[PDB]
Design a protein around this ligand. Structure first.
Ligand SMILES: *CC[C@H]1/C(=C/c2[nH]c(/C=C3N=C(/C=C4\NC(=O)C(CC)=C4C)C(C)=C\3CCC(=O)O)c(CCC(=O)O)c2C)NC(=O)[C@@H]1C
Ligand SMILES: *CC[C@H]1/C(=C/c2[nH]c(/C=C3N=C(/C=C4\NC(=O)C(CC)=C4C)C(C)=C\3CCC(=O)O)c(CCC(=O)O)c2C)NC(=O)[C@@H]1C
Ligand SMILES: C=CC1=C(C)[C@@H](Cc2[nH]c(/C=C3N=C(/C=C4\NC(=O)[C@H](C)[C@H]4CC)C(C)=C\3CCC(=O)O)c(CCC(=O)O)c2C)NC1=O
Ligand SMILES: C=CC1=C(C)[C@@H](Cc2[nH]c(/C=C3N=C(/C=C4\NC(=O)[C@H](C)[C@H]4CC)C(C)=C\3CCC(=O)O)c(CCC(=O)O)c2C)NC1=O
Ligand SMILES: C=CC1=C(C)[C@@H](Cc2[nH]c(/C=C3N=C(/C=C4\NC(=O)[C@H](C)[C@H]4CC)C(C)=C\3CCC(=O)O)c(CCC(=O)O)c2C)NC1=O
Ligand SMILES: C=CC1=C(C)[C@@H](Cc2[nH]c(/C=C3N=C(/C=C4\NC(=O)[C@H](C)[C@H]4CC)C(C)=C\3CCC(=O)O)c(CCC(=O)O)c2C)NC1=O
Ligand SMILES: C=CC1=C(C)[C@@H](Cc2[nH]c(/C=C3N=C(/C=C4\NC(=O)[C@H](C)[C@H]4CC)C(C)=C\3CCC(=O)O)c(CCC(=O)O)c2C)NC1=O
Ligand SMILES: C=CC1=C(C)[C@@H](Cc2[nH]c(/C=C3N=C(/C=C4\NC(=O)[C@H](C)[C@H]4CC)C(C)=C\3CCC(=O)O)c(CCC(=O)O)c2C)NC1=O
Ligand SMILES: C=CC1=C(C)[C@@H](Cc2[nH]c(/C=C3N=C(/C=C4\NC(=O)[C@H](C)[C@H]4CC)C(C)=C\3CCC(=O)O)c(CCC(=O)O)c2C)NC1=O
Ligand SMILES: C=CC1=C(C)[C@@H](Cc2[nH]c(/C=C3N=C(/C=C4\NC(=O)[C@H](C)[C@H]4CC)C(C)=C\3CCC(=O)O)c(CCC(=O)O)c2C)NC1=O
Ligand SMILES: C=CC1=C(C)[C@@H](Cc2[nH]c(/C=C3N=C(/C=C4\NC(=O)[C@H](C)[C@H]4CC)C(C)=C\3CCC(=O)O)c(CCC(=O)O)c2C)NC1=O
Ligand SMILES: C=CC1=C(C)[C@@H](Cc2[nH]c(/C=C3N=C(/C=C4\NC(=O)[C@H](C)[C@H]4CC)C(C)=C\3CCC(=O)O)c(CCC(=O)O)c2C)NC1=O
Ligand SMILES: C=CC1=C(C)[C@@H](Cc2[nH]c(/C=C3N=C(/C=C4\NC(=O)[C@H](C)[C@H]4CC)C(C)=C\3CCC(=O)O)c(CCC(=O)O)c2C)NC1=O
Ligand SMILES: C=CC1=C(C)[C@@H](Cc2[nH]c(/C=C3N=C(/C=C4\NC(=O)[C@H](C)[C@H]4CC)C(C)=C\3CCC(=O)O)c(CCC(=O)O)c2C)NC1=O
Lengths: 162, 164, 173, 177, 81, 172, 177, 162, 177
């Protein structure tokens, strides 16, 4: 869990030096961007179910074999669609958490740590979630200094998934 | 004679090869530079009785101690030798303005000069004063063209760095 | 300068000698790079270093240090420098260090680095201080310059738990 | 050695690709500003002598321990060797500026200079100072902002060429560091 | 008393017009609002002209008249202690 | 490390006098393009994986002998070894971009990389080609304004290309 | 686009707004004779500070009773307020020229200014003299017939700028009356 | 040498991660405080000799036994006053450097390091320099946010000296 | 050349004018005794900073009441601004010497300066003492009779310069009076 306040603490604690305004400016910049990130998190919260269902439908459109293939890893049956909507809800939740604290710390310790063996052992393809996130990145509605703050955490997850 | 042609011919002769494109393009550059290069040479040929005259007295203006007895300019004939040795250097500058490279200077003026000027106790800085006086007397739109003037001062500057 | 608080010792297996010429089973396959390993035995050394300090899930892909391995494979750094360039890794700092105090942290890396169990609690009291004043890196640089580390691991042997099993016995600790 | 042209030929030879119109435009732009390049190398080599003399004497007059007895620039022989040691790097920097590539600088002059200097016991700090003071004179002579001497030119600015010769002068300072 | 028209929250406030114009593709115009500020001395020393003095620089070396030059400007200048 | 601010402090202190009055506005212009430098870097950070993978796919599309059986980048460990090197030189260029000077790039990355490539037998001038394949993908990506106000970023993308050539010539 | 300019003044928030490209092309399409209007407002904002200074010194060198003790310009802080007021009036009439419309000139400064100057005891005719001096300076700067000051313009006639700002300055001088 | 840009580099280099939004805000805050620190550095540069002579006179007033004790460590002779003015010039120079780069990095590696054995072996008392710095902290003539930026680096040195 | 220098002053734009050899020959053809009128302004601009420093220290070591608390030179701000003012007056009188004409000396600094110093409470006679000290330093630098400082000139007499700047400094000292 890293936010810009936590490394401001972690650098001063290395020699155990006091917090001079080397780090006070670093937390002041967090306080600058905080407003433009918080309305992005609020608007992404307000658009949760629409974006989740649209992203799941985008994955089902772009990969139609996942709706037909007989297997536990696919969404051909009814509960596989529940797992698939649950995963996109998890991704959007981590995006809103990183928008709230101003750093990738939440998703770095809740989502991507150990994601490799999750996709490998349960035989999930990472290319599905990139389509799910590419749906959210352009059709969230956010525009301006707020959408530019929101898109960075979205395509950060696209970077670690790819 | 270090010129444009002798360089590429000696390089091809040391390699034992025929003249290729890299040798002929260097002669093309000499063709392209000769128009600006030979402009300064003919005017140095036409102005030399004035330029070494008014460059020689600048040497004794900077160094009036040379006319003292027991120095290098104690009588009139040694001052005539000084104007002689200044006119020789100006003739060599006119020569390297004609060849293209600095062959006549480092063959006839530069090589061995430090031995002569030391054992005959001639002050080396007094030559550099007379050359550097004529270097900045050149105003580029009036005496020569803009391109002849730089290629005239580059040989003059070269001599200064060789003497210093 | 506030030197180290004097604590006093105990009795352990590694404190006394083994008399064991030619051991076979209770030896933990010392992964030295004085062996001059090939391109794939270096991977075995790197995995064993990951098992020694991290446990077997801080060998995720997220916890992996892909550039430290590249300085090991070119012989820029040694094994000992690799070991606490691995302790200085922040996956070790958020997975192991942010979840316990400094008394438990002293024991959580005396055992993984020096390979032995703590003498008493007074040792954990005396070593808890270098975490505070000069930080984690000041703690591990003073841990890996002790005679307890250099006389048995040197600077090219991956550390291991020392004298865990008694020869005739099966159990050990 | 390579050049502003042979560089892109060694780069294209790894591709096994022909030098097409995509990457030829850098070479045509290199040709179209060739007159400024010649106008810059001429300006450097016309004042090269005072450059090395002022450089070594400026290195000395802010660190007088070199001319102190037992210092590295003490006797006449060591001082002459320093005055030529500097002239050689100025010559190779001028070669690299004329060629537009530092490949003549790195192997003919910089390959092994560091262990040479610390086998001789030459202090590195005075060498970086003598290199930096030559860089400061070269950027003044290329941009015609030298105080005590002005050279005549056409109209235009050569910050391009000045930063190129500055990177060439930082390569030697990084090599002997 | 003047509070009926000019209340204290909007007192002495005017728009400002700014021009980023250099005959360039990135050329802009901007409008902002401001609190205005002036002081006493600007009856004769106006704010665009205040504390500006003509500095002259000369480059000359003896006998180097062809290299000699002179230039002029007038920036903001301060006193060295 | 050295950034662009400490650079000016370094030779001011090595000369030993204060910063002159015309250097302070040379730093206040430097803080004027700050917002623009953040938009640039963040552009190259957010699609950093796609630059490396597309440049590698274009690199093998012209030089098969690298993926040929017997080639340098042939086995999966050796193929993975290219991608990390390309991500490292992309990462240190982005460090030097926000730093404002090239001093951190040649310090921890380009220092001795020629000697490693000359010792492993990795040939010298496709890591130059891979750096050039990353350069054109980066400065085309820094030109996109979609998601930023309209203006001039061209001086800073000239500097961004001015780091990639420095990385490309210290490896040949 | 002029509504975006009005938005700033509506909000009074002191945050800057800028127009270029298609937004500035829409502004110049919407408001009559834009290019000439831009040289016009540039010829005001580059000369504004000298204009208010010369105006108040012309008023004072006509009527010294304000600088006498008991005058309204006496005890110089008030004279600072008078400089501020004249410059504010200049800024609003410059906006009213830039808009081609005198509505905000009414709504933000001329609305209830005369009663304010009566309540403060400010003499009116001196301020009328001041704004007439600013009107003469404005039309002098707009005909490029400043005897002291020169800018280069694209050649042509600008009748609207002088008659436009003369109508605006007469609106101010009548509204203060 | 540590400025807020250098730890923004140093945190991303620990896992070797790319520069995210958690580090770009930290350097953005440096860019926020840069203007208020640079005019403080400029005004402290403009007031160098006045502040140095006033601080040396304040130490000579508060500790009169300094210019009267026969010894090499004291300013009783003429060259001891030159050493004493040189030291206060060094301190003010380090303060201006830390104001320029926005962090205590310059003085941390040029002054702090090994300042204990310097005061101990050459027998200098650290209480003299605290009086010298307490003169500069109140009589530099700045007020407001620029002075609040300037005072932090001044009394940081008071903290390490004491 | 003259028109560009005039437009720099008229615009007050803080952008430097720059001149070639043919340009310089045109201004020298306009100017009286340009050659000698150039060593003069060089002998001022190479000595200017020491001149204002020595002037204000001579004023202070004559009258300590300004450095006493309650004085005008007391406080951190006052010393800096007074140094700035004296140097500005020096720069304007150096221009007025270089022009051979005292019009801009009136129009840009001496116009309305006395009333400004009255409104700020600046004592006049101390500044008169200061500019007389600068006048003595200027004529000392112009006769090359500086006891401390030496420059080499082409030999000859320059009486007009001493009388020109004495008339100009007396114009300043009378206009402040
Ligand atoms: C878009 C839907 C696609 C899909 C989804 C699918 N997922 C699973 C199973 C799992 N998914 C995860 C992933 C996460 N769990 C988490 O808690 C988080 C955030 C911290 C993530 C990213 C895990 C752990 C599982 C296994 C347990 C579970 O959640 O059920 C399944 C079921 C697979 C199975 O049961 O073996 C499906 C169908 N698959 C598709 O076909 C869609 C394209
Ligand atoms: C306020 C003056 C008081 C004082 C000063 C004094 N100092 C010294 C000698 C030294 N001081 C230093 C300290 C520094 N040197 C540095 O370069 C820096 C910044 C990086 C610091 C803080 C050092 C190293 C010396 C010894 C070498 C030297 O500078 O001369 C002396 C002379 C002591 C001696 O010669 O043994 C004096 C007198 N002493 C006072 O009495 C004043 C109160
Ligand atoms: C073809 C190439 C060529 C040259 C470059 C010159 C160079 C040159 N000059 C002199 C010779 C001389 N040169 C000088 C010159 C001077 N003394 C001074 O005080 C000033 C330094 C300077 C005048 C400006 C004098 C005085 C002599 C005669 C020395 C003597 O014997 O007293 C000599 C010896 C032969 C002689 O007596 O002339 C030579 C080779 N002559 C050449 O033939
Ligand atoms: C081969 C090249 C060559 C030259 C450079 C000149 C050098 C030169 N100039 C002058 C004589 C002169 N030379 C100039 C020229 C100049 N004076 C200046 O102040 C300017 C810097 C510069 C270009 C405008 C002038 C103006 C005179 C007459 C007055 C004087 O001597 O200065 C004379 C005397 C005889 C004569 O007039 O020619 C000579 C030899 N002559 C040449 O044959
Ligand atoms: C191809 C490129 C090339 C070079 C760059 C030089 C490099 C070079 N320099 C020196 C040798 C030297 N170089 C210096 C120079 C300096 N020492 C200082 O204190 C100053 C910093 C600096 C002068 C500015 C000195 C003092 C010596 C040795 C002189 C001696 O020890 O007698 C030597 C050993 C040879 C010798 O000492 O005789 C070599 C190879 N030579 C080359 O062939
Ligand atoms: C302590 C001893 C000491 C010295 C010896 C000088 C040496 C010296 N010269 C220059 C700086 C320079 N030096 C030259 C050199 C020359 N100018 C010319 O035109 C001639 C051809 C050539 C020999 C005189 C140039 C061109 C510059 C650039 C600025 C300038 O013109 O002075 C610099 C500044 C370097 C920098 O800024 O990094 C220094 C230290 N100064 C000193 O403090
Ligand atoms: C073989 C000998 C040889 C040379 C010595 C140079 C001489 C030279 N320089 C330039 C021409 C030029 N040289 C410069 C360079 C500069 N101008 C400045 O004011 C700066 C101080 C400096 C760096 C910007 C510029 C800007 C031009 C004009 C641009 C151009 O011609 O391409 C030109 C072309 C135009 C002309 O004819 O004048 C030539 C021939 N070229 C050569 O072929
Ligand atoms: C935390 C991260 C962070 C950022 C990325 C920037 C983002 C950012 N950029 C700008 C502001 C800007 N940003 C750009 C940048 C660009 N425009 C282009 O056309 C190019 C594509 C691109 C260059 C890379 C420009 C040109 C402006 C100024 C626009 C204007 O003049 O109105 C602003 C407006 C506020 C201001 O004036 O500073 C902000 C918040 N700031 C931040 O705090
Ligand atoms: C006795 C007191 C007294 C004064 C202070 C001046 C004040 C003054 N100036 C102008 C007149 C003017 N004032 C300016 C203003 C300026 N000119 C510039 O070039 C600068 C940029 C700018 C600030 C100086 C202009 C451009 C004119 C019109 C041209 C002119 O008459 O000079 C007018 C005439 C306006 C009119 O009624 O028509 C007056 C009274 N005149 C006086 O009689
Ligand atoms: C939005 C538009 C807008 C304005 C134009 C000004 C208008 C204005 N001016 C003043 C206030 C004043 N205005 C003047 C101005 C003058 N007195 C004279 O004799 C001259 C004729 C003239 C200057 C040339 C003076 C002297 C005062 C101060 C009066 C006082 O001391 O009470 C006040 C009262 C508040 C205050 O005292 O500051 C207001 C509302 N304010 C605004 O918000
Ligand atoms: C954002 C900043 C901005 C400006 C300042 C103007 C600058 C400007 N003015 C004109 C162009 C012009 N400007 C004028 C105006 C005048 N000419 C005169 O001689 C009178 C003094 C004055 C009348 C008020 C005229 C007459 C033209 C040519 C016709 C026209 O385009 O209107 C043009 C188009 C042609 C050219 O490039 O010159 C531009 C870009 N436009 C801008 O976009
Ligand atoms: C008690 C306080 C006190 C002082 C601070 C000095 C200040 C001072 N200096 C000079 C006088 C002067 N001051 C200078 C200035 C300088 N000389 C140089 O060589 C430098 C370049 C430059 C800065 C130091 C010159 C050239 C003179 C004239 C020659 C002289 O008298 O020394 C004068 C006499 C002016 C006059 O009235 O005629 C005074 C009062 N004298 C004092 O009594
Ligand atoms: C174009 C020409 C031009 C000038 C000459 C100056 C003139 C000038 N000086 C001051 C302002 C000042 N001027 C002085 C100067 C002095 N006080 C003394 O006792 C000494 C006699 C003298 C220094 C030697 C001081 C001390 C102040 C500040 C007064 C204050 O604190 O309010 C001000 C008011 C603005 C301000 O406070 O900065 C102005 C306009 N400005 C200009 O634009
Ligand atoms: C651009 C920079 C620039 C300058 C600084 C001057 C430098 C200068 N001064 C003179 C030349 C001269 N300068 C002086 C002036 C003086 N002599 C004295 O002994 C007095 C102290 C002082 C009086 C003020 C005199 C008397 C001459 C000779 C006559 C003359 O040419 O005016 C000359 C022509 C002869 C020569 O080269 O020396 C030049 C180029 N000219 C320039 O172009």
């Amino acid at each position: 869990m890293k936010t810009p306040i936590t490394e401001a603490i972690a650098t001063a604690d290395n020699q155990g030096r006091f917090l001079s305004n080397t780090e006070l400016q670093a937390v002041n910049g967090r306080y600058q961007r905080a407003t433009a990130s918080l309305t992005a998190a609020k608007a992404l919260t307000g658009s949760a179910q629409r974006l989740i269902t649209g992203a799941a439908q985008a994955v089902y459109n772009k990969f139609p074999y996942t709706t037909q293939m007989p297997g536990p890893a696919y969404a051909s049956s009814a509960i596989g669609k529940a797992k698939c909507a649950r995963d996109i809800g998890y991704y959007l939740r981590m995006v809103t958490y990183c928008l709230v604290v101003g750093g990738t710390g939440p998703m770095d310790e809740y989502l991507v740590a150990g994601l490799e063996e999750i996709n490998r052992s349960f035989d999930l393809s990472p290319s599905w979630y990139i389509e799910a996130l590419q749906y959210i990145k352009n059709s969230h509605g956010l525009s301006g200094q707020v959408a530019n703050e929101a898109n960075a955490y979205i395509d950060y997850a696209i970077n670690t998934l790819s | 004679m270090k010129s444009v042609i002798t360089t590429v011919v000696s390089a091809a002769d040391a390699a034992g090869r025929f003249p290729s494109n890299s040798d002929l393009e260097s002669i093309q550059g000499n063709i392209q530079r000769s128009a600006a290069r030979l402009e300064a040479a003919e005017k140095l040929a036409g102005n030399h009785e004035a330029v070494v005259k008014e460059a020689g007295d600048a040497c004794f203006a900077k160094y009036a101690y040379l006319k003292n007895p027991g120095e290098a300019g104690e009588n009139q004939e040694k001052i005539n030798k000084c104007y002689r040795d200044v006119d020789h250097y100006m003739r060599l500058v006119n020569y390297c303005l004609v060849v293209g490279g600095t062959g006549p200077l480092d063959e006839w003026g530069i090589a061995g000069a430090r031995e002569v000027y030391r054992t005959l106790n001639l002050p080396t800085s007094a030559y550099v004063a007379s050359i550097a006086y004529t270097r900045d007397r050149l105003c580029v739109p009036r005496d020569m063209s803009a391109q002849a003037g730089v290629e005239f001062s580059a040989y003059l500057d070269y001599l200064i760095n060789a003497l210093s | 300068s506030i030197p180290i608080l004097k604590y006093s010792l105990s009795t352990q297996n590694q404190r006394v000698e083994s008399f064991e010429v030619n051991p076979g089973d209770e030896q933990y396959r010392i992964y030295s790079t004085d062996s001059l390993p090939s391109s794939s035995e270096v991977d075995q050394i790197i995995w064993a270093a990951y098992r020694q300090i991290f446990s077997e899930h801080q060998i995720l892909k997220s916890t992996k240090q892909p550039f430290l391995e590249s300085q090991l494979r070119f012989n820029q750094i040694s094994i000992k420098d690799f070991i606490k360039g691995l302790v200085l890794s922040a996956p070790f700092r958020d997975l192991n260090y942010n979840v316990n105090n400094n008394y438990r942290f002293v024991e959580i890396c005396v055992q993984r680095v020096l390979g032995r169990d703590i003498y008493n609690e007074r040792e954990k009291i005396a070593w808890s201080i270098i975490i505070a004043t000069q930080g984690l890196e000041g703690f591990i640089d003073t841990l890996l310059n002790t005679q307890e580390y250099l006389s048995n691991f040197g600077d090219s042997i991956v550390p291991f738990q020392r004298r865990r099993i008694i020869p005739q016995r099966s159990k050990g600790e | 050695m390579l050049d502003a042209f042979s560089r892109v030929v060694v780069n294209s030879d790894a591709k096994a690709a022909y030098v097409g119109g995509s990457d030829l435009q850098a070479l045509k732009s290199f040709i179209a500003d060739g007159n400024k390049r010649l106008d810059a190398v001429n300006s450097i080599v016309s004042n090269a002598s005072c450059m090395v003399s002022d450089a070594v004497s400026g290195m000395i007059c802010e660190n007088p321990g070199l001319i102190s007895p037992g210092g590295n620039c003490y006797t006449n022989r060591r001082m002459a060797a320093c005055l030529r040691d500097g002239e050689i790097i100025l010559r190779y920097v001028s070669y690299a500026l004329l060629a537009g590539d530092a490949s003549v600088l790195e192997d003919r002059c910089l390959n092994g200079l560091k262990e040479t200097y610390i086998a001789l016991g030459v202090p590195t700090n005075s060498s970086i100072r003598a290199v930096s003071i030559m860089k400061a004179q070269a950027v003044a002579f290329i941009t015609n902002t030298a105080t005590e001497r002005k050279m005549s030119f056409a109209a235009g600015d050569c910050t391009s060429l000045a930063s190129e010769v500055a990177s060439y002068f930082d390569r030697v300072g990084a090599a002997i560091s | 008393l003047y509070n009926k028209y000019f209340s204290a929250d909007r007192l002495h406030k005017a728009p400002e017009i700014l021009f980023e114009y250099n005959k360039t593709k990135y050329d802009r115009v901007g409008v902002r609002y401001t609190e205005v500020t002036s002081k006493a001395s600007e009856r004769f020393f106006p704010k665009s002209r205040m504390n500006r003095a003509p500095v002259i620089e000369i480059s000359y070396r003896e006998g180097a008249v062809s290299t000699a030059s002179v230039s002029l400007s007038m920036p903001e200048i301060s006193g060295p202690p | 490390m050295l950034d662009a601010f400490a650079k000016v402090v370094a030779q001011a202190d090595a000369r030993g006098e204060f910063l002159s009055n015309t250097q302070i506005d040379a730093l206040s212009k430097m803080v004027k393009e700050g917002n623009q430098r953040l938009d640039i870097v963040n552009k190259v950070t957010s699609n950093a994986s796609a630059i490396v993978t597309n440049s590698a796919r274009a690199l093998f599309a012209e030089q098969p002998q690298l993926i040929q059986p017997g080639g340098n980048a042939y086995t999966s460990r050796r193929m993975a070894a290219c991608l990390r090197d390309m991500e490292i030189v992309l990462r240190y260029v982005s460090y030097a971009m926000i730093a404002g000077d090239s001093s951190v790039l040649d310090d921890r990355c380009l220092n001795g990389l020629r000697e490693t490539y000359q010792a492993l037998g990795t040939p010298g001038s496709s890591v130059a080609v891979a750096i050039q394949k990353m350069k054109d993908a980066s400065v085309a990506l820094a030109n996109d304004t979609t998601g930023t106000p309209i203006g001039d970023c061209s001086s800073l993308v000239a500097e961004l290309a001015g780091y990639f050539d420095r990385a490309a010539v210290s490896v040949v």
